[PDB]
Amino acid sequence: MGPGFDFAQAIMKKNTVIARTEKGEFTMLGVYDRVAVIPTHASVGEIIYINDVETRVLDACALRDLTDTNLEITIVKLDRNQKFRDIRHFLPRCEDDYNDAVLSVHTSKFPNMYIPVGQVTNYGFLNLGGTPTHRILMYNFPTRAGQCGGVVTTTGKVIGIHVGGNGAQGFAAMLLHSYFTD
């Protein structure tokens, strides 16, 4: 409907796949080459389904900060025959607050879904399902089951992936450029 939704749509159309694990269907953001991200609670194994196709996982790393605290981001390298468009230049370099963000989801349950969530706070620490978690972004939207892995964008930046909510607020794990230096 406006330039926020335009950037969000461009990311969804070229840089997302539907990932299925034994824990559910997730929006999965492709970042560059065969490297993607997904919430750690997806419990990625040796094999994953990508757009309903059986795919070997070449590497999977559940990220933690240097205090050994969960970040809720798993970086996955997929044995796929095609590369993602390189979007690393859209990733923020530092932890920050944002205005006017969009959360975008693409699954069998929620196809072509876009939500204007508004202001995004650098929340920091969250007890997420009992797990102490750092680098959490917060937005005041009543997000629901089905939205985990959803992409959070502003115009020109891909800032996080949706990892949970409490019924009134939604929470995303930060994406930082430093995660994807090769």
Which residue in 41, 106, 134, 162 is the catalytic one?
Answer: 41
Q: How is 44-81 classified by DSSP, letter by letter?
A: --SEEEETTEEEEEEEEEEEE-TT--EEEEEEEEE--S
Which residue in 25, 134, 148, 162 is the catalytic one?
Answer: 148
Count the residues in the chain: 182
* Known catalytic residue at 46: no
- In eight-state DSSP terms, residue 110 is S
Sign of CA dihedral 95, 91, 25, 64: negative
Instruction: Retrieve residue 128's tokens.
Output: 């997420």
Which residue in 25, 72, 106, 134 is the catalytic one?
Answer: 72
* Known catalytic residue at 61: no
* Known catalytic residue at 54: no
**Residues designated catalytic:** 41, 72, 148
